Amino acid sequence: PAYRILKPWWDVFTDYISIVMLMIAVFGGTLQVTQDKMICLPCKWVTKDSCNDSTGPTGIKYDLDRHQYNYVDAVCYENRLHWFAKYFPYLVLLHTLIFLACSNFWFKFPRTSSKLEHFVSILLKCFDSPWTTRALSETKSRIEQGIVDRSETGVLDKKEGEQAKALFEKVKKFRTHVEEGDIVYRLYMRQTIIKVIKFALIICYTVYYVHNIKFDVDCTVDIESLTGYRTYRCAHPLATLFKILASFYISLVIFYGLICMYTLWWMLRRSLKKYSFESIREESSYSDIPDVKNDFAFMLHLIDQYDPLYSKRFAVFLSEVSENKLRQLNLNNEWTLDKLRQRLTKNAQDKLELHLFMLSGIPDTVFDLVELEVLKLELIPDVTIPPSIAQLTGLKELWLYHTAAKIEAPALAFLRENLRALHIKFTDIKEIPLWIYSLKTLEELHLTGNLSAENNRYIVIDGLRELKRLKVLRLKSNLSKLPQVVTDVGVHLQKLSINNEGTKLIVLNSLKKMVNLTELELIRCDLERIPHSIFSLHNLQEIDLKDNNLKTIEEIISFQHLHRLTCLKLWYNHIAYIPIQIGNLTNLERLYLNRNKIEKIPTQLFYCRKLRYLDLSHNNLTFLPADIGLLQNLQNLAVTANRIEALPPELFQCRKLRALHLGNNVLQSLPSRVGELTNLTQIELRGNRLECLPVELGECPLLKRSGLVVEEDLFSTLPPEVKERLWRADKE
Amino acid sequence: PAYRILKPWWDVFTDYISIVMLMIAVFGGTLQVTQDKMICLPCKWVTKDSCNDSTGPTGIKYDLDRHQYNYVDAVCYENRLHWFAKYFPYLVLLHTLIFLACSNFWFKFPRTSSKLEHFVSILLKCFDSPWTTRALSETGVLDKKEGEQAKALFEKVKKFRTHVEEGDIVYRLYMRQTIIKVIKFALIICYTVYYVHNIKFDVDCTVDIESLTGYRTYRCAHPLATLFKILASFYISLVIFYGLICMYTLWWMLRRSLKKYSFESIREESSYSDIPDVKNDFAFMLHLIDQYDPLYSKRFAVFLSEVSENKLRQLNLNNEWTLDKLRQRLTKNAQDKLELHLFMLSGIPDTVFDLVELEVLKLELIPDVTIPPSIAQLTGLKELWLYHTAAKIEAPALAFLRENLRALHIKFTDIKEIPLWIYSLKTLEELHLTGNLSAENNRYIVIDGLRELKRLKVLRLKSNLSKLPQVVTDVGVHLQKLSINNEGTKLIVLNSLKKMVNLTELELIRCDLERIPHSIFSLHNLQEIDLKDNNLKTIEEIISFQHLHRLTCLKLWYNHIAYIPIQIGNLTNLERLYLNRNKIEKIPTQLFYCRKLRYLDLSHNNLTFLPADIGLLQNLQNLAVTANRIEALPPELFQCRKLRALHLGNNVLQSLPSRVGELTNLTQIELRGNRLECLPVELGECPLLKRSGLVVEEDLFSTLPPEVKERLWRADKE
């Protein structure tokens, strides 16, 4: 079968020399059995216990019948013929049989036969794998930007990829099962040593004894009482042929010994317990191929001796870069177009979103979508953006959550002319792609992750100057100081949102250069004090100082400079009181002050006649001044988690009030003037000292059962007409 | 095994000859084993150790018992019989064994066995390739799977040629084997024919044992001598034939220099000139196969070539894209033209050149493509887009394009991706360049041939220009429309544009001018000026636009413009004036002196009010003040009856004035996001306004009368 690849040439040679030696052994045996005789004639005159060897001549007479001659032949053949002449073929047969048993012991020893057959089968199926040919088929300024070189990959069938993956798993399991044993190498070493020592023995003693095969043998067999003679001279007819065969056999054994000594030299000097693969990975440039341990590098040295081709065809299949390539090619087939189409969702801005969580790479079937809007790559390793991304004409936002993604020049150009918003989340600078600064159409940047550096502070983001069309910028990076490059690029910024997640920040007179800024958020900057520089921004419209540990906010008087400021948010702080000067803030449309230490609402706050939103929940409020009816523009009001006990009737003067959040209060009785409010749509009642719902609550034109949040104990008190109408309206 | 094709005729003849020689060796060996004796009789009368040989006859009596005859036979046979008479069959057997070992040494030697088995494995399936028969019949429809098989077999052939040609081992073995065969044939003719005479029927032995038998010399008969002589003559005749064949093979192997294969007849007949001659150890296997059959070598050359590779790739691509599936992907572009988009293909499919209705072609990431001369089959084609596609062209196709190409969209990631033959055209009108082309000490050398465009009229240089190129200046003496987009890179002109007096439309988008240059005032024939996204804080320089007597449309949007200079009143000819995305806070009344105004868009600004003078612009058709702080609409807005669409969303509008129904021409109005309460009933008297043109929420649409809802839904239906 395939076992022919195991044997090197020095084993074929000893498989054929063994056959030839066995052939001559069989010939010698079948000659010595049916043909070998000894023709003996007595010597009449004996000199020194030896044959003297000293009318036409007449033949001598011995007066011996034929059977006497046969008997003396038998006796002299048994006694005075050297055993190496009689038993040469049997010795040759025995030595060749033990040579053969030494050469083929491991193939029949079941401890190593299973290992060898498994190895040869797996190497064969790794030689015929169509992935193996494909793997070898592939053979400053730009370099530092993370722009990878163009690379083009094909397709593999689903079944073919499954077979390749299964073969990879089987190869790894076999490698674990085999690299630990080290039984085959020991057996091969023992076999070679035994062959060498046996060659030494049977090339020494055979040459020692080969001189005893003589044609003429003198025997003194000491039988007079049977034949009457003392000594005989005999001819061994097959002595010369046996000598020739013995010389031929010792020549064959000499060649066998030379080849076995070559085998011992090759197996000893190399120290082949480890295979390096130093040629293939220096030729094809596939570094990730580990060196091999015991019991597996010898099985590969034998194969290399048979043919180096299988060594490459297995080393490539044993690499990990190939495994990553196969993983990509299987992942591409794994995700159908429709399965990713169904995976699409809707984001906050009502776009089509695809969130790839925990994938080995980007399934290149995503770039066959035309309707994708936001792509989110979270926890993807060292991925590279292919140039196929240009198919995504609708791509607008790219999210890089812990993915140091590289790109190619065409895809980089396409993003450079189409990308709008980029979301960056990282743990270190290396996870930030450095090619973002070539994106000259980006507008929104979301840098998440610490970036302040020691002795090289604020050097990575120096490319922000290149992003000319940057408008929005959100930084959540535990900043201890405003970076200079951000300050410089703020000259055309139209929004900022910093978030030090509790870290203290010092503006240190730097925010004044962002003359185009309109919205400014400083969340968890631990300011504890509004800097005056914020009031130097003559274009601001949205100021948020969430969780700055603010206590006194009387600086809001300077907000008089801002002549277009509408929305203000100082929620989630320790604001003890609302300063009266807020009444001067005429332009306000929304005001959020929840989650504060606020106790009372001063009346001056109701001079903001354009106010529309008022969120004063989770404070120390105990009542509501009657001026609430002045703000006829009000449409929302939340007083959740307060000590409000009686609702003032004037509250119901604002007819276009669309909501009321009366949760977690001490309201004893809900005023019946609620039916006055024609524009009420969502009113929350859970958490009050209420006992019955006034009927007028149920006559709101658009309020429905779902829109009414209340305990079922209170809802049970509604008139049945009200319950029926609310449920019927809710059902449609 | 399938190695039968690797044996030439002489190898089969030598195998048969060796089998016959082995057979006669076995026969002469068993005969020598079972019967070869000597029959000796002593000579009574001896003359000089020889037999003198000098009433019915009576037999002579030697007085020798049978065993003494056996002993003398053994002694004479051992000593006075020539070794060649005894050991002839064993020598024949040894010579045949070593001949067979020489013959089959390269098959059993693993180093050269692997190469032969791999070569025959590849060649058998190359002969079996379903594409070989088609290609050689052509000297068509094919399955995709068999195309992949053909591609894989091309890969295997390339790898095989890479591996094999380095070897030079099979040739060395097949040389040394024949050398050894020839020398051993010479030796075993030399010694044999010399020694063949020693086989004699009768011999005379003076074995000199008198003490045992009593005689001096004996005459013996060798019964097998005649038969052994016959077999010796037969064996030497066979050896002579063997040597003749071996010397013939040596001469044949030393005639043509088998280390190199010419490979010229097949390439000369089948028109595949891209077949380089194979190196050592690969010419030899082809030579042996040719000795068996040239057909396999011819069926292997098709895969060995390069033209066949490209043709197979083209056939695979053609099978990939059918004509009807190609038509299914045909679409229409924005410019009201028929366009075909090709993205990331190996080459240009040959099937695209049948849809003559195609007008615009786009090539996006299609590497190493040569434009066939068959594009003349497409005459309705008018635009070719080369998107990162460095495409080579042929003389007939280029000559055809020189008279059939008006617009050529070019996008390049590098200079060499720009075709050098684009300027060779002469009927071209529109050229779009998209890519950085700046260089240091070799600045703007790529577009030097731009002067050859004697017909160019439309240009668009989105090329990251830090300066206005000099070749553009030289060529602009005939241009009409110029578009420039620097992607935010500052543009430097500095008196390098005014040579272009034939211009009519000029666009400087994202050039970061920060200030209108005076040179534009030289362009007297200019009619449409755009300065989008130039960080323009003030636009006072437009006062100089009095020179331009046909300025109709002016756009200054996406800037930081603070105010509208009143001098804009002098620009009476303005028809469409875009100023959205600006820091403008108020509208001077002088802007209303331009009564010819038809489009006025002022969205995304700092506006708070609308002047009553807006009724003076009776020619106004579309007005947009979206995303502003406009409190209420003045009734003078409705003085301009021909208003067809208003954009009023994202504002602080409280209620809609009732004069809305007065404007019959009003076909659209946008009001989403405004603090609106109830729509006026006059919305029911709008003649051509429909639901699609009424951009408003359904919760406010509920306020509209059901008659108005009926009319709106009826208009929406038809």
Side-chain angles (χ1 to χ4, degrees), chain A residues 121-139 141-265:
Chain A
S121 61
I122 284 180
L123 171 61
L124 261 229
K125 60 204 311 174
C126 289
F127 183 85
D128 202 9
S129 195
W131 213 93
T132 54
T133 161
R134 170 186 281 268
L136 288 317
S137 174
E138 311 298 327
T139 296
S141 298
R142 177 194 172 186
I143 69 174
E144 55 88 13
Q145 301 178 19
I147 314 181
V148 87
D149 194 7
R150 284 186 47 82
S151 304
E152 40 277 354
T153 180
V155 63
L156 286 315
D157 198 335
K158 182 178 182 178
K159 298 181 180 181
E160 159 62 26
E162 277 293 336
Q163 294 308 312
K165 170 185 174 182
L167 193 51
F168 255 107
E169 291 188 11
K170 290 178 182 180
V171 163
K172 295 186 180 184
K173 269 303 176 180
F174 172 86
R175 184 185 175 185
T176 310
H177 162 71
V178 167
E179 279 184 345
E180 193 181 8
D182 200 342
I183 184 58
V184 172
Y185 184 84
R186 302 212 306 256
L187 278 194
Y188 201 89
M189 172 68 64
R190 294 172 192 173
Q191 290 177 173
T192 294
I193 293 173
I194 293 179
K195 293 179 192 178
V196 173
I197 66 103
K198 200 170 58 199
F199 148 75
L201 294 196
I202 76 179
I203 218 274
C204 186
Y205 94 98
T206 313
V207 176
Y208 180 86
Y209 277 133
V210 85
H211 81 276
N212 302 115
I213 307 182
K214 298 168 297 181
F215 167 77
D216 28 18
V217 175
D218 336 312
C219 43
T220 304
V221 297
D222 192 8
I223 41 179
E224 292 194 46
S225 48
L226 294 187
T227 69
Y229 291 83
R230 270 298 299 176
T231 81
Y232 312 82
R233 185 170 197 83
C234 312
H236 194 196
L238 295 178
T240 314
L241 232 203
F242 274 9
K243 172 168 294 177
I244 297 303
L245 288 192
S247 173
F248 185 68
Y249 167 76
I250 69 172
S251 62
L252 288 194
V253 175
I254 274 183
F255 280 178
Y256 200 110
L258 292 194
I259 288 178
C260 267
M261 284 158 53
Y262 185 98
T263 291
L264 190 66
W265 179 96

Side-chain angles (χ1 to χ4, degrees), chain A residues 442-445 464 467-472 492-493:
Chain A
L442 192 71
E443 292 177 338
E444 174 184 334
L445 186 52
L464 282 177
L467 307 187
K468 301 308 175 183
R469 278 169 59 106
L470 188 64
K471 294 311 171 185
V472 192
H492 54 262
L493 275 177

Side-chain angles (χ1 to χ4, degrees), chain A residues 523-542:
Chain A
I523 301 100
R524 289 181 293 183
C525 301
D526 237 329
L527 292 184
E528 304 167 339
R529 161 184 299 188
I530 311 180
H532 165 263
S533 303
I534 302 180
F535 309 93
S536 179
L537 315 176
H538 299 163
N539 291 263
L540 203 63
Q541 296 185 14
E542 265 101 317

Side-chain angles (χ1 to χ4, degrees), chain A residues 62 69 136 240 589 656, chain B residues 65 78 159 212 675 677:
Chain A
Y62 305 101
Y69 282 117
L136 288 317
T240 314
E589 278 201 6
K656 53 175 52 186
Chain B
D65 38 353
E78 167 62 34
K159 298 295 183 179
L212 296 173
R675 43 202 62 186
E677 299 171 340

Side-chain angles (χ1 to χ4, degrees), chain A residues 397-437:
Chain A
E397 303 200 348
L398 189 68
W399 292 48
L400 298 189
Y401 277 13
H402 294 145
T403 297
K406 293 188 176 183
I407 202 165
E408 320 181 18
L412 179 124
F414 162 78
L415 296 188
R416 168 197 191 94
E417 300 307 323
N418 289 86
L419 189 56
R420 282 299 183 265
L422 182 68
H423 291 72
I424 298 294
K425 186 176 183 61
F426 60 94
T427 63
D428 199 359
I429 306 307
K430 64 175 181 299
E431 305 191 24
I432 295 180
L434 219 58
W435 50 261
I436 64 178
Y437 304 136

Side-chain angles (χ1 to χ4, degrees), chain B residues 235-353:
Chain B
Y235 168 71
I236 65 182
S237 67
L238 285 189
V239 166
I240 271 186
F241 274 23
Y242 202 82
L244 292 193
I245 284 190
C246 286
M247 294 189 66
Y248 160 87
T249 290
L250 178 67
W251 160 85
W252 164 87
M253 194 183 50
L254 250 47
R255 172 232 281 185
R256 202 183 168 184
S257 178
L258 313 187
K259 276 182 168 297
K260 177 168 53 59
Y261 197 100
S262 293
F263 237 157
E264 89 292 354
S265 178
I266 160 147
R267 72 181 178 184
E268 215 166 354
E269 178 70 17
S270 304
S271 175
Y272 291 126
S273 185
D274 305 4
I275 308 183
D277 299 7
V278 291
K279 291 296 300 178
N280 46 1
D281 192 19
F282 202 11
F284 181 71
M285 301 178 182
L286 279 187
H287 272 158
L288 299 195
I289 289 299
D290 205 323
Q291 296 289 159
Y292 179 84
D293 196 357
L295 177 56
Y296 302 88
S297 63
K298 281 168 290 182
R299 296 273 211 82
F300 187 86
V302 54
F303 277 68
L304 195 55
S305 69
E306 194 156 15
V307 169
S308 59
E309 170 190 13
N310 297 340
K311 188 182 181 184
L312 188 270
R313 189 180 307 176
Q314 285 278 358
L315 262 296
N316 277 72
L317 204 46
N318 292 14
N319 297 18
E320 246 277 292
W321 297 121
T322 76
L323 248 181
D324 71 327
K325 181 159 73 279
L326 220 188
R327 178 184 292 99
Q328 201 74 10
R329 209 165 175 268
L330 185 63
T331 53
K332 307 182 62 182
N333 66 343
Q335 288 77 347
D336 195 2
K337 300 176 182 179
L338 200 44
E339 146 261 20
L340 175 63
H341 193 220
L342 299 172
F343 188 82
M344 287 197 64
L345 291 185
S346 58
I348 317 172
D350 305 319
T351 169
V352 315
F353 313 104

Side-chain angles (χ1 to χ4, degrees), chain A residues 4 13 35 53 57 59-60 62 69 73 133 136 240 391 416-417 440 469 516 589 612 656, chain B residues 33 44 62 65 67-68 78 87 117 155 159 210-213 215 343 462 487 510 675 677:
Chain A
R4 94 190 188 280
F13 274 57
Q35 218 73 11
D53 286 327
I60 324 178
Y62 305 101
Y69 282 117
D73 293 0
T133 161
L136 288 317
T240 314
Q391 289 193 29
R416 168 197 191 94
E417 300 307 323
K440 306 183 183 306
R469 278 169 59 106
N516 283 130
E589 278 201 6
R612 305 165 67 92
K656 53 175 52 186
Chain B
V33 153
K44 301 196 62 55
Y62 297 100
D65 38 353
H67 228 61
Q68 282 183 106
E78 167 62 34
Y87 305 145
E117 92 95 346
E155 295 184 0
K159 298 295 183 179
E210 320 178 44
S211 41
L212 296 173
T213 67
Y215 293 88
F343 188 82
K462 188 178 181 179
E487 312 169 22
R510 311 212 305 205
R675 43 202 62 186
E677 299 171 340

